[PDB]
Design a protein around this motif. Structure first.
Motif: not given
Ligand SMILES: [Zn+2]
Ligand SMILES: [Zn+2]
Lengths: 7, 65
Positions: A4-6, B1, B12, B14
């Motif tokens: 995932k690349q938020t 999650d 998080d 990225g």
């Protein structure tokens, strides 16, 4: 893979 | 999650990757995974035991908070 690349 | 990375940080950053067995998320930088070389299957360091530099992971993530 599952990643995932938020932004 | 669930996030469980070797750095211990829960944010998080990225670019994260998910263990195919236990489903925890980890930071690719911490786990030494090159964004240009993502594997087809990925297991965390508990599901596939291996040694990593935990202190490197921590110092990289501190500056990402
Ligand atoms: Zn991490
Ligand atoms: Zn796992």
């Amino acid at each position: 893979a599952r990643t995932k690349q938020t932004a | 999650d669930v996030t469980r990375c070797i750095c211990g940080f829960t944010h998080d950053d990225g670019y994260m990757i998910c263990c195919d067995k236990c489903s925890v998320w980890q930071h690719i930088d911490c786990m030494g995974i090159d964004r240009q070389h993502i594997p087809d299957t990925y297991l965390c360091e508990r599901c596939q035991p291996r040694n990593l530099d935990k202190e490197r992971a921590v110092l990289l993530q501190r500056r990402k908070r």
